[PDB]
Design a protein that fits this description.
Structural class of chain B: alpha+beta
Largest sheet of chain A: 11 strands, mixed
Strand content of chain B: 15-25%
Largest sheet of chain B: 4 strands, antiparallel
Oligomer: part of a larger assembly
Shape of chain A: globular
Helix content of chain A: 10-25%
Family (chain E): Belongs to the helicase family. SKI2 subfamily.
Subcellular location (chain E): Nucleus
Subcellular location (chain A): Nucleus; Nucleus speckle
Organism (chain E): Homo sapiens
Structural class of chain A: alpha/beta
Protein name (chain A): Pre-mRNA-processing-splicing factor 8
Strand order of the largest sheet of chain B: 6-5-8-9
Chain lengths: 269, 417, 404, 365, 52
């Protein structure tokens, strides 16, 4: 509904997100070994956790290259934030993929998103989202691009990395129903993949050109077909003043209130 | 009626500012200084009133001892709050930047230590306000039963969540500051006077916060704090059109341009006609334009060359993009240039740049060096922001993507023995 | 109880809306009393409502019902030693009434009425002019200063008393004279001396030699003072302004400004930053106006200013004139010592008989047990005062609050 | 930082000494001994400051005067002394403690302050050395907030040094072509390989705006370099480029090389002087000279320049008074009218005049 | 007649003009009236002797 109370509770909550930042876990599970392995620089991870909110999913797009002479590892060197808004179970971000100059040097590795409740599976909403990106984008390679799910555990953050299997990709291309239990969904659709955090190199951010990224507070101003440019600069926090204009634009006041207490005492500067 | 000095109450604050000016090095200079006070001649000619028995007055006729004791107490008070480093042995004082900030903003030494302990790099606006509310200057402000009816309404109509706190002084002061910035009228008279107090002291308070947090180098919070400063000064949130800082403008026109969302920096592309076409008020088209070009704008270029593997040299070229009017910009315009690290997290360097009246349109050249570190980063950022002007800023990514650092230098030939 | 307390707050808000700003003791008392009447069962119909109207003022037929509803919704009816500066520094400074006893004038009397004591004192009797004495015209005082006094033919008695020490000595000044004596024009002369200290034949009052600092206790006062000081000193061709400047934007602005006026505080911050240290050594004169502000909580500031100025002069060996102005109060010789005013040639004292318009003051106080009752009594007292203003005289009431 | 600041600083120090409650602490001999030295003085305040054993030195001071002060100090007659920054280089008298403040100096040309060149600062610092006696030497450098970290880094570490030849380039190629040391473009590249620039380019390529460390990177870089230097030199008619390969000196370049000048200067001359030019024009053309652009302005002296212009024979067209070319025009006219000046700008006038005749003759040619 | 900062800008001057010419024998104003532009009154009387 209106969730007026919700906006504030979550707002003073999120001011502590940086506490999570220093306790994180990473899924270690069976390594395919024929697969790629993705390294996520820790700095972007920290900042990405810090801008988020504990209910609305936010998402970011992964861009990186493989180190010289080492084709089987993908360093993620960049995260791009685009105009978007979340639900608690999913994220709506526009049809256009990032286009920009700093990006030309690297390849897209997929996307990363916050996940209010921890689940040991790739949410149907995700496999469906990813397949549907992939359908419309040849730029995204099935085998090279992943979905990193970053979940908020108590006092902590914990993350896993998924790849679609071809079974999954086909299901997802097909899938309409976005409910939590669509028909024909299977654990056969996704696969876990190997990912490591790193302090060895720094990742950087790309961010919308004329606005910021977070449209949650304006849902009517967001459209699938909306176009955007980019810039080199960091994301503002979720509850940052700019993301919520409607609330700072709440002033209904007559100036003459100032008539009262017209004793002006200053005597400074 | 006798004229007596209230000096004793303020004695710790007075002493600090004198150490800050360098007019008192040690305890001795301090007693010499206090020997010039009104309180000194009053303590001389009416000791009975000022807490001196006549016998110990006879024991120390010049008040050398009592004055010294008072100075020592003041020094201890200053030190415990870290305004001064003074060891009892030498009797010498040393100033700290916290002390200077304290003196410069006329903020008391309890408030300043509250800031020292409370302020951390990672503070949100939500928290910045609370820390402001904890200022020792507000110690006596309390919340009255009758007004707790209105404070609640005000509490739900504020943009920055207070909800960390319930109804207690912190909340009252916070919601008050917000009310003032959000420009809200208050029914109760008590609250009005209170709010006035809070907001008037708020300039110096928030500013000392900015100065501190900037000297520390913590980028994000120095942004949040300078912006707060501006929001207090101008009585508006940033989410409102910068054109408002020109009071010369009609309110309905401003509200009209706020109605349609058309990002402000996109007004420069438009001519006098194209402007009026947005809000369908073409009669205004010329006048608006004037203001848009009156709004201070800098464009900036950079020439960067590596000096050693550790340090790069930066030549920043600031070219004024705005039309100067001394009935708006006045005699001088102030800007902070600060180069921030990869994440806009740490401020690697900062200068106060001031462009005078004469030199608008003259490009100024600033030269400064910045360090680089072991995981060579994708870029730095060079930010420039007006001091007083709200929503007035220009950022310049300085990319290292192509940087080639010099070969590390071999060790000097050892001096043989 | 809380079920009850939550209604009590609402009742207090309603009573506040009627009365407006008032002392807490009185408003609370009235509310408790309005509630008392509502709760009591000795009054019926209009009577209770009429009583409330008489007590709480006119009430809309719509508001009374709400008040009744609130009432109904109520369930129940050598090494140094450390010392404490708290018990030392005086609380409620400048309102202390430190003197043990006050001597009443023969003319003054006491007549106590019900609920209020009323005190009356007559007008004062002007001191007879001295034998072979006369006021100084604007003729017989030095040639240059005479300019800018136009419209005014004669000097006031007190002005005429101290003009000599004003223009002939750098000795520090203190005057205590009643409101209306026209003190400004004394200090003006103290300025016209300095304005005269730098003069040339072929040019007058060349203005880069002196920068004067006028410290006044209130902000408006600064405005109006720069306003009249400008007009007056203009004969010399000197331009002044208020120092409201933020430090950096207007320094280079006030660089070209002389005889600047400011509140003691402004001067203190601005000196702590060093905005002053570019100005100083060009300062030969500082005026402390209403220096009796020493007694206020703000007192330490003035104390900090002057102390710094003196302590500084001892290092630089370059001196400065200091001109103190005060209301007429004892401890004058102490303030003299403080300003380094030689009591011999530099001290000036005048008692309350020198107020240009003699003052007959009557004091009225309320000894009412209850604040609520006292508030009603105060209104009655005003009516009595109004009757006296029946004739062709001007009455004026200064209330605690603007809204009130 | 300033010629005049030296006087004022000494007075401030004396005031501080007086405050300390002990006076004349820096004078190690009686007043009777200093009299023979003080008989030789013009400056009246200097007499006073020297009274307490304090000293000073600036552009005003004669060499004898300086030698005397130095003698008095080293022999112990005087405890301490203040000195203009300009005198850091040519000063033959050392010390124990050396403190530098207000390193940035004022430049009228852009109307801004600019930092002391680092080597200067290092020289001032090296001026605290007394190996004969002291076991230590001390320096305090008081500077702005901005400039703090820079000194903290670079005063302690050994210094890097880079070549500037890439920028100041034309004059030498011209002169060398004249000697037939560079007979054609190839000889030019070869000549380049004898330099320190050649050395450094591959060491720190981003400094010289060379984009790669490779062989053909450096090679292409030097190539583009002689290419544009010879082009710019040919455009100016100082040389002739035949077949695109060979070069020969021409009239202009020959002159230039012969009289040894700022090359841009005499290019300016070349596009300025025309058939009808006369002394009015020759004044401003000779004023705009490379040498003229080297004039120094102190404390933004613009109003003074305007006042000087107000009484000079030839006025100017909306002149900026922080510009040294304007200043040299006005100083030159002042010299022609035999008008008296403050010694401050009089020293300047004399320096202009020192190199004037050469320039004039070059115009004749 | 009552004059206060709260009301207005020019009508304060328009009230002061009215009082000087004896428009109103009794007027109520805040202390800022005594500290601001200078006009006296035959008899003055502060009410309640209290301030916030």
């Amino acid at each position: 509904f209106s969730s007026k109370t919700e906006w504030r509770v979550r707002a003073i909550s999120a001011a502590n997100l940086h506490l999570r930042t220093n306790h994180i876990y990473v899924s270690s599970d069976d390594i395919k070994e024929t697969g790629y392995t993705y390294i996520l620089p820790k700095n972007v991870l920290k900042k990405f956790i810090c801008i988020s909110d504990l209910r609305a999913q936010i998402a970011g797009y992964l861009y990186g290259v493989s180190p010289p002479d080492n084709p089987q590892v993908k360093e993620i060197r960049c995260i791009v934030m685009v105009p978007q808004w979340g639900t608690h179970q999913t994220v709506h971000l526009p049809g256009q993929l990032p286009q920009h100059e700093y990006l030309k040097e690297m390849e897209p590795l997929g996307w990363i998103h916050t996940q209010p409740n921890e689940s040991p599976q790739l949410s149907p909403q995700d496999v469906t989202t990813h397949a549907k990106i992939m359908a419309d984008n040849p730029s995204w390679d099935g085998e090279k691009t992943i979905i990193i799910t970053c979940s908020f555990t108590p006092g902590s953050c914990t993350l896993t990395a998924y790849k679609l299997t071809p079974s999954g990709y086909e299901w997802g291309r097909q899938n309409t129903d976005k409910g939590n239990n669509p028909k024909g969904y299977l654990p056969s659709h996704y696969e876990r993949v190997q990912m490591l955090l790193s302090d060895r190199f720094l990742g950087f951010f790309m961010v919308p050109a004329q606005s910021s990224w977070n449209y949650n507070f304006m849902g009517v101003r967001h459209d699938p077909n909306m176009k955007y440019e980019l810039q080199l600069a960091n994301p503002k926090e979720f509850y940052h003043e700019v993301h919520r204009p409607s609330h700072f634009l709440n002033f209904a006041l007559l100036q003459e209130g100032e008539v009262y207490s017209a004793d002006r005492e200053d005597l400074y500067a | 009626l006798p004229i007596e000095s209230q000096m004793v109450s303020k004695l710790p604050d007075m002493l600090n500012a004198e150490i800050v000016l360098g007019n008192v090095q040690n305890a001795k200079d301090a007693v010499n200084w206090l020997g010039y006070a009104y309180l000194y001649i009053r303590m001389l000619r009416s000791p009975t009133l000022y807490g001196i028995s006549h016998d110990d007055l006879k024991g120390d006729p010049l008040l050398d001892q009592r004055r010294l004791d008072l100075v020592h107490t003041a020094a201890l008070m200053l030190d415990k709050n870290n305004l001064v480093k003074y060891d009892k042995k030498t009797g010498n004082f040393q100033v700290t930047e916290l002390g200077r900030i304290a003196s410069h903003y006329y903020i008391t030494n309890d408030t300043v230590q509250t800031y020292n302990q409370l302020l951390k790099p990672t503070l949100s606006e939500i928290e910045l306000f609370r820390v402001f509310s904890l200022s020792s200057e507000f110690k006596n402000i309390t919340v009255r039963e009758e007004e707790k009816l209105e404070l609640q309404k005000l509490l739900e109509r504020v943009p920055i969540p207070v909800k960390e706190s319930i109804e207690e002084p912190s909340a009252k002061i916070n919601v008050l500051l917000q009310a003032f910035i959000s420009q809200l009228k208050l029914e109760g008279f008590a609250l009005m006077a209170d709010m006035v107090y809070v907001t008037q002291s708020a300039g110096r308070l928030m500013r000392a916060i900015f100065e501190i947090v900037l000297n520390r180098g913590w980028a994000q919070l120095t942004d949040k704090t300078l912006n707060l400063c501006k929001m207090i000064d101008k009585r508006m949130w940033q989410s409102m059109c910068p054109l408002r800082q020109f009071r010369k403008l009609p309110e309905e026109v401003v509200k009209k341009i706020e109605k349609k969302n058309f990002p402000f920096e996109r007004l420069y592309d438009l001519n006098h006609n194209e402007i009026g076409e947005l809000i369908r008020m073409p009669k205004m088209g010329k006048t608006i334009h004037k203001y848009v070009h009156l709004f201070p704008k800098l464009e900036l270029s950079v020439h960067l060359q590596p000096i050693t593997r550790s340090t790069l040299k930066v030549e920043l070229t600031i070219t004024p993009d705005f039309q100067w009017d001394e009935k708006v910009h006045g005699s001088s315009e102030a800007f902070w240039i600060l180069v921030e690290d990869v994440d806009s997290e740490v401020i690697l360097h900062h200068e106060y740049f001031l462009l005078k009246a004469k030199y608008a349109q003259d490009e100024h050249l600033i030269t400064f060096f910045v360090p680089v570190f072991e995981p060579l980063p994708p870029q730095y950022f060079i930010r420039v922001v007006s001091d007083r002007w709200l929503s007035c800023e220009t950022q310049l990514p300085v990319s290292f993507r192509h940087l080639i650092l010099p070969e590390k230098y071999p060790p000097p030939t050892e001096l043989l023995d | 109880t809380k079920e009850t307390r939550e209604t009590y707050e609402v009742l207090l808000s309603f009573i506040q809306a009627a009365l407006g700003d008032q002392p807490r003791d009185i408003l609370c008392g009235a509310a408790d009393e309005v509630l008392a009447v509502l709760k009591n069962e000795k009054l019926r119909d209009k009577e209770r409502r009429k009583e409330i109207d008489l007590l709480l003022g006119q009430t809309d037929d719509t508001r009374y019902h709400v008040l009744v509803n609130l009432g109904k919704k109520i369930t129940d009816y050598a090494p140094r030693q450390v010392l404490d500066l708290e018990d030392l520094v005086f609380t409620q400074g400048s309102h202390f009434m430190a003197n043990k006893r006050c001597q009443l004038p023969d003319g003054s009397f006491r007549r106590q009425r019900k609920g209020y004591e009323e005190v009356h004192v007559p007008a004062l009797k002007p001191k007879p002019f001295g034998s072979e004495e006369q006021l100084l015209p604007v003729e017989k005082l030095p040639k240059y200063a005479q300019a800018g006094f136009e419209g005014f033919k004669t000097l006031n008695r007190i002005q005429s008393k101290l003009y000599r020490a004003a223009l002939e000595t750098d000795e520090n000044l203190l005057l205590c004279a009643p409101t209306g004596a026209g003190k400004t024009n004394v200090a003006l002369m103290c300025m016209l001396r300095e304005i005269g200290k730098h003069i040339n034949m072929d040019g007058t009052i060349n203005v880069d030699d002196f920068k004067i600092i006028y410290i006044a206790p209130m902000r408006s006062l600064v405005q109006e003072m720069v306003g009249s000081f400008g007009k007056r000193l203009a004969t010399y061709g000197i331009t002044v302004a208020e120092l409201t400047g933020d430090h950096q934007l207007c320094k280079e602005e006030i660089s070209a400004t002389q005889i600047i006026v400011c509140t003691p505080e402004k001067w203190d911050i601005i000196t702590r930053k060093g905005g002053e240290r570019t100005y100083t050594q060009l300062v030969r004169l500082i005026i402390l106006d209403e220096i009796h502000l020493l007694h206020d909580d703000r007192g330490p500031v003035l104390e900090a200013l002057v102390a710094r100025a003196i302590r500084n002069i001892e290092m630089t060996q370059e001196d400065v004139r200091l001109i103190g102005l005060s209301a007429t109060l004892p401890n004058y010789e102490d303030v003299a010592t403080f300003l380094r005013v030689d009591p011999a040639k530099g001290l000036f004292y005048f008692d309350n008989s020198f107020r240009p318009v003699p003052l007959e003051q009557t004091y009225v106080g309320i000894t009412e047990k209850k604040a609520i009752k006292r508030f009603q009594i105060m209104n009655e007292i005003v009516y009595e005062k109004i009757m006296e203003h029946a004739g062709k005289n001007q009455v004026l009431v200064f209330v605690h609050s603007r809204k009130e | 930082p300033s010629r005049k600041q030296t006087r004022l600083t000494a007075i401030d120090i004396l005031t501080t000494c007086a405050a300390d409650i002990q006076r004349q602490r820096f004078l190690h001999c009686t007043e009777k001994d200093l009299i023979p030295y003080l008989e030789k003085l013009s400056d009246s305040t200097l007499k006073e400051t020297l009274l307490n054993g304090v000293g000073y030195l600036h552009e005003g001071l004669s060499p004898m005067e300086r030698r005397l002060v130095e003698q008095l100090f080293s022999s112990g007659a005087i405890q301490v002394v203040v000195a203009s920054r300009s005198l850091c280089w040519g000063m033959n008298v050392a010390a124990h403690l050396v403190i530098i403040m207000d390193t940035q100096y004022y430049n009228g040309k852009i109307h801004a302050y600019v930092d002391y060149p680092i080597y200067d600062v290092l020289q001032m610092v090296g001026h605290a050395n007394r190996p004969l006696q002291d076991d230590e030497g001390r320096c305090v450098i008081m500077c702005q907030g901005s400039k703090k970290d820079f000194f903290k880094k670079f005063l302690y570490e050994p210094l890097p040094v880079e070549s500037h030849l890439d920028h100041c380039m034309h004059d030498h190629f011209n002169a060398e072509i004249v000697t037939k040391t560079i007979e054609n473009k190839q000889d030019a590249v070869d000549y380049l390989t004898w330099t320190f620039l050649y050395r450094r380019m591959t060491q720190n390529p981003n400094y010289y705006n060379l984009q790669g460390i490779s062989h053909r990177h450096l090679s292409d870089h030097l190539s583009e370099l002689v290419e544009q230097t010879l082009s710019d030199l040919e455009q100016s008619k100082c040389i002739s480029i035949e077949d695109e390969m060979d070069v020969a000196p021409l009239n202009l370049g020959m002159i230039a090389a012969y009289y040894y000048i700022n090359y841009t200067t005499i290019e300016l001359f070349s596009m300025s002087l025309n058939a009808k030019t006369k002394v009015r024009g020759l004044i401003e053309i000779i004023s705009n000279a490379a040498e003229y652009e080297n004039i120094p302005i102190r404390h933004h002296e613009d109003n003074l320049l305007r006042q000087l212009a107000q009484k000079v024979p030839h006025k100017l067209n909306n002149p900026k008074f922080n510009d040294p070319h304007v200043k040299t025009n006005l100083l030159l006219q002042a010299h022609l009218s035999r008008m008296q000046l403050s010694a401050e700008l009089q020293s300047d006038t004399e320096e202009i005049l020192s190199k004037a005749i050469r320039l004039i003759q070059a115009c004749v040619d | 007649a009552i004059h206060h900062a709260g009301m207005t800008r020019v009508d304060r001057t328009l009230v002061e003009d009215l009082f000087a010419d004896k428009h109103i024998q009794v007027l109520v104003s805040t202390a800022t009236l005594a500290w601001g532009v200078n006009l006296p009154a035959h008899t003055v009387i502060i009410k309640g002797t209290q301030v916030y």
